Ligand binder design. Structure first.
Ligand SMILES: [Ca+2]
Length: 120
């Protein structure tokens, strides 16, 4: 589903302040990662990223391309292509705990300035 900013702000409520990352920061992160598209899928030469949070099949989730993924999130990647972000959020928390926000953002600044712009 292609979501609006406001739908993302609502749907991501359970990430609010997780690991110190504010809800606006998470909305900014989703914008820059997928454009709020829950079906986003992006391939590079050897791996694929899925969903709103572009979760990868190298270490985070298992899929056909990489059946021996480390699968830290213990889930099939295609569960990140549906319209229920409950599991996406569970795994995004695990990603934050392990790699931090730089999983998504080349530089933290991208989502630390004028954060009130990401509110509904
Ligand atoms: Ca999902």
């Amino acid at each position: 589903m292609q979501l609006t900013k406001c739908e993302v702000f609502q749907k991501l409520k359970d990430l609010k302040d997780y690991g110190g990352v504010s809800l606006p920061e998470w909305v900014c992160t989703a914008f820059h990662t997928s454009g709020y598209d829950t079906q986003a899928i992006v391939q590079n030469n050897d791996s694929t990223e899925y969903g709103l949070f572009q979760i990868n099949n190298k270490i985070w989730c298992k899929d056909d391309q990489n059946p021996h993924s480390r699968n830290i999130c213990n889930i099939s990647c295609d569960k990140f292509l549906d319209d229920d972000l409950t599991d996406d959020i569970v795994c995004a928390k695990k990603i934050l705990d392990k790699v931090g926000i730089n999983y998504w953002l080349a530089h933290k600044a991208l989502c630390s300035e004028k954060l009130d712009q990401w509110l509904c």
